[PDB]
Amino acid sequence: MVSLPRMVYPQPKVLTPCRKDVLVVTPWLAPIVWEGTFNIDILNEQFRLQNTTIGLTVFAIKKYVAFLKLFLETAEKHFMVGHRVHYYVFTDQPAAVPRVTLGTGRQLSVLEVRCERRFLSEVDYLVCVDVDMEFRDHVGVEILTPLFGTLHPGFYGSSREAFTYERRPQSQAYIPKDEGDFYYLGGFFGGSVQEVQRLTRACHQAMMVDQANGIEAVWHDESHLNKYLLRHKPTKVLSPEYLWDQQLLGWPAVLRKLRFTAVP
Ligand SMILES: CCCCCCO[C@@H]1O[C@H](CO)[C@H](O)[C@H](O)[C@H]1O[C@@H]1O[C@@H](C)[C@@H](O)[C@@H](O)[C@@H]1O
Ligand SMILES: O=c1ccn([C@@H]2O[C@H](COP(=O)(O)OP(=O)(O)O)[C@@H](O)[C@H]2O)c(=O)[nH]1
Ligand SMILES: [Hg+2]
Ligand SMILES: [Hg+2]
Ligand SMILES: [Hg+2]
Ligand SMILES: [Hg+2]
Ligand SMILES: [Hg+2]
Ligand SMILES: [Mn+2]
């Protein structure tokens, strides 16, 4: 918006692809975020000049409160470092939330559960993730955009017919075998506050319609998220570097970094 300052960095090479092993842009021209595609210094400048605030939301119900300490401590080392961050922890056990030391410009709010406009006034972007995870490497502003989904680590190389989308036409989440771009994760999505609220509102309404008709999608919210992103294309797609399970899937050559991973 304001001009970027002078910066010294390698010149982009028009005749050299960033990657010869993976797709780095979708058919609707949204970038697919892989290591080796972005210069983080340029992106950090762009987002800091806008004084960007990122909200990170997690739910920790019942036994999942045990995952909060590692989740938050590692987020402090790797998530949006240098930028304003507001953590929102939705839990049924407020007194069980660990006291984690936060860097400057970062804050945490504990919301007890069994608001909407609140997010609009407190943050610019919302990132919604699973709590039984830990950050192991950089997760930064390269992911920010109006609406993003993340490629599920178990299906990124799969054909659409093999995707575990909801296949019963009676469900609002129904996707037939000849449709679908990717299989996105329910555990890592986000975007501007406005777009995230539109997505969550749509999934809530679709799930209510299914409940009324006596049907529950095969993968619950994730099935609905996939239907939403099929019909409302995300403006960025995150590669599986952003949500990986090393125990189950190892460390493939196509992954130069494992950024956020499942906890055993
Ligand atoms: C065909 C081989 C696929 C291996 C990954 C399966 O992951 C599960 O996928 C379903 C949809 O088919 C759901 O998304 C489910 O939540 C996934 O399991 C969870 O994520 C994986 C990566 C792993 O961490 C599991 O332990 C989780 O339960
Ligand atoms: O009793 C529960 C069950 C689920 N969750 C939340 O729901 C997310 C999805 O669940 P889970 O991690 O069990 O899903 P999986 O990745 O194994 O499909 C978790 O990350 C938690 O944030 C929770 O807080 N309490
Ligand atoms: Hg590149
Ligand atoms: Hg959220
Ligand atoms: Hg979430
Ligand atoms: Hg929902
Ligand atoms: Hg959703
Ligand atoms: Mn999980």
Coordinates of C-alpha atoms and ligand atoms in Angstrom, one line a residue:
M1 CA 0.0 0.0 0.0
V2 CA 2.7 2.4 1.2
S3 CA 5.8 1.8 -0.9
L4 CA 8.2 -1.0 0.1
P5 CA 11.7 0.2 1.0
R6 CA 14.8 -0.6 -1.1
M7 CA 15.6 -4.4 -0.6
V8 CA 18.4 -6.5 -1.9
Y9 CA 17.5 -10.1 -2.9
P10 CA 18.0 -12.5 -5.7
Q11 CA 16.4 -11.6 -9.0
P12 CA 13.4 -13.8 -9.9
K13 CA 14.4 -16.0 -12.9
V14 CA 11.7 -15.9 -15.6
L15 CA 13.2 -18.9 -17.3
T16 CA 13.6 -21.1 -14.3
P17 CA 10.6 -22.9 -12.6
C18 CA 10.4 -22.7 -8.8
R19 CA 9.6 -26.4 -8.7
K20 CA 9.7 -29.2 -11.3
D21 CA 8.1 -31.7 -9.0
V22 CA 4.9 -30.1 -7.9
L23 CA 2.0 -27.8 -9.0
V24 CA 2.5 -24.3 -7.7
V25 CA -0.6 -22.6 -9.0
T26 CA -4.2 -23.8 -9.3
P27 CA -6.4 -23.6 -12.5
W28 CA -8.0 -20.4 -11.1
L29 CA -4.6 -18.8 -10.6
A30 CA -4.3 -19.2 -6.8
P31 CA -0.7 -19.9 -5.6
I32 CA -0.1 -23.3 -3.9
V33 CA 2.3 -22.6 -1.1
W34 CA 5.5 -24.7 -1.1
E35 CA 9.0 -24.0 0.1
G36 CA 11.0 -22.5 -2.8
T37 CA 8.1 -20.4 -4.2
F38 CA 8.3 -17.3 -1.9
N39 CA 10.7 -14.7 -0.5
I40 CA 9.6 -14.3 3.1
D41 CA 11.4 -11.0 3.5
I42 CA 9.3 -9.3 0.8
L43 CA 6.1 -10.8 2.2
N44 CA 7.0 -9.8 5.8
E45 CA 7.5 -6.2 4.6
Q46 CA 4.2 -6.1 2.8
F47 CA 2.2 -7.4 5.8
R48 CA 4.1 -5.5 8.5
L49 CA 3.5 -2.2 6.6
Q50 CA -0.2 -3.0 6.9
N51 CA 0.2 -3.7 10.7
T52 CA -1.5 -7.1 10.1
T53 CA -3.0 -8.9 13.1
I54 CA -3.6 -12.6 12.9
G55 CA -6.1 -14.5 15.0
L56 CA -5.3 -18.2 15.7
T57 CA -8.2 -20.2 17.0
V58 CA -8.2 -23.7 18.6
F59 CA -10.6 -25.8 20.5
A60 CA -9.5 -27.7 23.6
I61 CA -12.4 -29.8 24.9
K62 CA -12.1 -32.4 27.6
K63 CA -8.8 -34.3 27.3
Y64 CA -7.5 -32.1 24.5
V65 CA -6.6 -29.4 27.0
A66 CA -3.4 -31.5 27.5
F67 CA -2.1 -30.5 24.0
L68 CA -2.2 -26.7 24.7
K69 CA 1.2 -26.3 26.3
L70 CA 3.2 -27.8 23.4
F71 CA 0.9 -26.2 20.8
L72 CA 1.3 -22.7 22.2
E73 CA 5.0 -22.9 23.1
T74 CA 5.8 -24.0 19.5
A75 CA 3.5 -21.5 18.0
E76 CA 5.6 -18.9 19.8
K77 CA 8.7 -20.1 18.1
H78 CA 7.2 -20.5 14.6
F79 CA 3.8 -18.9 14.0
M80 CA 3.8 -15.4 12.5
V81 CA 6.8 -14.3 14.5
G82 CA 7.3 -10.5 14.2
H83 CA 3.6 -9.9 13.5
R84 CA 0.7 -9.2 15.9
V85 CA -1.0 -12.4 17.0
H86 CA -4.1 -13.0 19.1
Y87 CA -4.7 -16.6 20.2
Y88 CA -8.3 -17.6 20.9
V89 CA -8.6 -20.8 23.0
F90 CA -12.1 -22.2 23.2
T91 CA -12.3 -24.6 26.1
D92 CA -14.6 -26.2 28.7
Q93 CA -11.8 -26.0 31.3
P94 CA -10.5 -22.4 31.5
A95 CA -8.5 -23.2 34.7
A96 CA -6.6 -25.9 32.9
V97 CA -5.2 -23.7 30.2
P98 CA -1.4 -23.6 30.7
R99 CA 0.4 -20.4 31.6
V100 CA 2.6 -20.0 28.5
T101 CA 5.0 -17.1 28.1
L102 CA 4.3 -15.0 25.0
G103 CA 6.5 -12.7 23.0
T104 CA 5.7 -9.0 22.7
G105 CA 2.7 -8.1 20.5
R106 CA 1.0 -11.4 21.1
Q107 CA -1.9 -12.1 23.3
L108 CA -4.2 -14.9 24.4
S109 CA -7.9 -15.0 25.2
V110 CA -9.6 -18.0 26.9
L111 CA -13.2 -18.4 25.8
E112 CA -15.3 -20.8 27.9
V113 CA -17.7 -23.0 25.9
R114 CA -20.1 -25.8 26.5
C115 CA -18.2 -12.8 19.8
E116 CA -19.0 -13.0 16.1
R117 CA -18.4 -9.2 15.5
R118 CA -15.6 -9.5 18.1
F119 CA -13.2 -11.0 15.5
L120 CA -14.0 -8.3 13.0
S121 CA -12.7 -5.6 15.3
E122 CA -9.7 -7.5 16.7
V123 CA -7.9 -9.2 13.8
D124 CA -7.5 -9.0 10.1
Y125 CA -7.2 -12.7 9.4
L126 CA -8.3 -15.9 11.1
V127 CA -6.4 -19.2 11.1
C128 CA -8.3 -22.2 12.4
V129 CA -6.4 -25.3 13.4
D130 CA -6.4 -28.6 15.3
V131 CA -4.8 -28.4 18.8
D132 CA -3.2 -31.9 18.9
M133 CA -0.3 -30.6 16.9
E134 CA 3.0 -28.9 17.2
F135 CA 4.9 -26.3 15.0
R136 CA 8.3 -27.4 13.9
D137 CA 9.2 -24.8 11.3
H138 CA 8.1 -21.4 9.9
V139 CA 4.3 -20.8 9.4
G140 CA 4.0 -17.1 8.4
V141 CA 2.4 -14.5 6.3
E142 CA 2.9 -16.4 3.1
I143 CA -0.4 -18.2 4.0
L144 CA -2.5 -15.0 4.3
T145 CA -5.1 -14.3 1.7
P146 CA -8.9 -13.9 1.6
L147 CA -9.6 -17.7 1.8
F148 CA -7.3 -20.7 2.0
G149 CA -7.5 -24.4 2.4
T150 CA -4.7 -26.9 3.0
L151 CA -4.0 -30.1 1.0
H152 CA -4.6 -33.1 3.2
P153 CA -1.3 -35.0 3.7
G154 CA -2.9 -38.4 3.0
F155 CA -4.4 -37.6 -0.4
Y156 CA -2.3 -34.9 -2.2
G157 CA -1.2 -37.4 -4.8
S158 CA -4.7 -39.1 -5.1
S159 CA -7.1 -39.0 -8.1
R160 CA -10.4 -37.3 -7.4
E161 CA -12.4 -40.6 -7.6
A162 CA -10.4 -41.9 -4.6
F163 CA -11.0 -38.8 -2.4
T164 CA -13.2 -39.5 0.6
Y165 CA -15.7 -36.8 -0.2
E166 CA -19.3 -37.4 0.9
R167 CA -20.9 -39.4 -2.0
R168 CA -24.5 -39.7 -1.0
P169 CA -26.7 -37.2 -3.1
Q170 CA -29.0 -36.9 0.0
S171 CA -26.3 -34.9 1.8
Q172 CA -25.6 -31.2 1.3
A173 CA -21.9 -32.1 1.2
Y174 CA -22.3 -34.4 -1.8
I175 CA -19.6 -34.3 -4.5
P176 CA -19.8 -36.8 -7.4
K177 CA -16.9 -38.7 -8.8
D178 CA -16.3 -36.4 -11.8
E179 CA -16.0 -33.3 -9.6
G180 CA -13.3 -32.0 -7.2
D181 CA -10.0 -30.2 -7.3
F182 CA -8.3 -31.3 -4.1
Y183 CA -9.0 -32.9 -0.8
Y184 CA -8.7 -30.2 1.8
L185 CA -8.2 -30.7 5.6
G186 CA -10.7 -29.7 8.2
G187 CA -7.8 -29.1 10.5
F188 CA -6.1 -26.1 8.9
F189 CA -8.0 -23.4 7.0
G190 CA -8.4 -19.6 7.3
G191 CA -8.6 -16.3 5.5
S192 CA -10.0 -12.8 6.2
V193 CA -12.4 -12.6 9.0
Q194 CA -15.3 -12.0 6.6
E195 CA -14.5 -15.0 4.4
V196 CA -13.9 -17.4 7.4
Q197 CA -17.3 -16.4 8.9
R198 CA -19.0 -17.0 5.5
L199 CA -17.4 -20.4 5.3
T200 CA -18.3 -21.4 8.9
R201 CA -21.9 -20.0 8.5
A202 CA -22.3 -22.0 5.3
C203 CA -21.1 -25.3 6.9
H204 CA -23.3 -24.8 9.9
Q205 CA -26.4 -24.3 7.8
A206 CA -25.5 -27.3 5.6
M207 CA -24.9 -29.5 8.6
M208 CA -28.3 -28.4 10.1
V209 CA -30.1 -29.3 6.8
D210 CA -28.4 -32.8 6.8
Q211 CA -29.3 -33.3 10.5
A212 CA -33.0 -32.5 9.7
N213 CA -32.9 -35.1 6.9
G214 CA -31.3 -37.7 9.1
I215 CA -27.9 -37.9 7.5
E216 CA -24.4 -37.1 8.8
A217 CA -21.5 -36.6 6.2
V218 CA -18.8 -39.3 6.2
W219 CA -16.2 -36.9 7.5
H220 CA -18.4 -34.4 9.2
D221 CA -17.3 -30.7 9.0
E222 CA -14.4 -31.7 6.7
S223 CA -16.8 -33.0 4.1
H224 CA -18.7 -29.7 4.2
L225 CA -15.5 -27.7 4.0
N226 CA -14.6 -29.6 0.9
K227 CA -18.0 -28.9 -0.7
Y228 CA -17.6 -25.2 0.2
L229 CA -14.1 -24.9 -1.3
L230 CA -15.2 -26.8 -4.5
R231 CA -17.8 -24.1 -5.1
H232 CA -15.9 -21.1 -3.7
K233 CA -12.3 -21.4 -4.9
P234 CA -9.7 -20.6 -2.3
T235 CA -7.4 -17.7 -3.1
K236 CA -4.3 -19.6 -1.8
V237 CA -3.9 -23.4 -1.2
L238 CA -1.3 -24.6 1.4
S239 CA 0.8 -27.6 0.6
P240 CA 1.0 -30.5 3.0
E241 CA 4.1 -28.9 4.6
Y242 CA 1.5 -27.1 6.6
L243 CA -0.2 -30.1 8.2
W244 CA 1.7 -33.4 8.2
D245 CA 1.8 -36.6 10.2
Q246 CA 5.4 -38.0 10.2
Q247 CA 4.6 -41.2 12.1
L248 CA 2.0 -42.1 9.5
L249 CA 3.6 -40.7 6.3
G250 CA 7.3 -40.2 6.8
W251 CA 9.2 -37.4 5.1
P252 CA 8.8 -37.5 1.3
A253 CA 11.2 -35.8 -1.1
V254 CA 8.5 -33.3 -2.1
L255 CA 8.4 -31.9 1.4
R256 CA 11.4 -29.6 2.0
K257 CA 10.0 -28.6 5.3
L258 CA 7.6 -30.2 7.9
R259 CA 6.0 -27.1 9.4
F260 CA 3.1 -28.2 11.6
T261 CA 2.7 -31.8 12.6
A262 CA 0.5 -34.3 14.4
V263 CA 1.5 -35.1 18.0
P264 CA 1.8 -38.8 18.9
Ligands
LIG1 C1 -5.3 -43.7 2.0 C2 -4.3 -43.2 3.1 C3 -4.7 -42.0 4.0 C4 -3.9 -41.7 5.4 C5 -4.5 -40.5 6.2 C6 -6.0 -40.6 6.6 O1 -6.2 -39.4 7.4 C7 -7.5 -39.3 7.8 O2 -8.3 -38.9 6.6 C8 -9.7 -38.7 6.9 C9 -10.4 -38.5 5.6 O3 -10.3 -39.6 4.7 C10 -9.9 -37.6 7.9 O4 -9.4 -36.4 7.3 C11 -9.1 -37.9 9.2 O5 -9.3 -36.9 10.1 C12 -7.7 -38.2 8.9 O6 -7.0 -38.7 10.1 C13 -6.3 -37.7 10.8 O7 -5.2 -37.1 10.1 C14 -4.2 -38.0 9.7 C15 -3.1 -37.2 8.9 C16 -3.5 -38.7 10.9 O8 -2.9 -37.7 11.7 C17 -4.7 -39.4 11.7 O9 -4.1 -40.0 12.9 C18 -5.7 -38.4 12.1 O10 -6.8 -39.0 12.7
LIG2 O1 -13.0 -34.1 22.9 C1 -12.6 -33.5 22.0 C2 -12.6 -34.0 20.5 C3 -12.0 -32.9 19.5 N1 -11.5 -31.7 19.9 C4 -10.9 -30.7 18.9 O2 -11.3 -31.2 17.6 C5 -10.1 -31.3 16.7 C6 -10.3 -32.4 15.7 O3 -10.1 -33.6 16.4 P1 -9.0 -34.8 16.3 O4 -7.7 -34.1 16.6 O5 -9.4 -35.8 17.3 O6 -9.2 -35.2 14.8 P2 -8.3 -36.1 13.8 O7 -7.1 -35.1 13.4 O8 -7.6 -37.2 14.5 O9 -9.2 -36.4 12.7 C7 -9.0 -31.5 17.7 O10 -7.7 -30.9 17.2 C8 -9.4 -30.6 18.9 O11 -9.0 -29.2 18.7 C9 -11.5 -31.3 21.2 O12 -11.1 -30.2 21.6 N2 -12.1 -32.2 22.2
HG3 HG 11.1 -19.6 -7.1
HG4 HG -11.9 -20.1 13.2
HG5 HG -10.3 -25.4 13.8
HG6 HG -19.9 -26.9 10.7
HG7 HG -16.6 -25.5 7.3
MN8 MN -6.2 -33.6 15.0

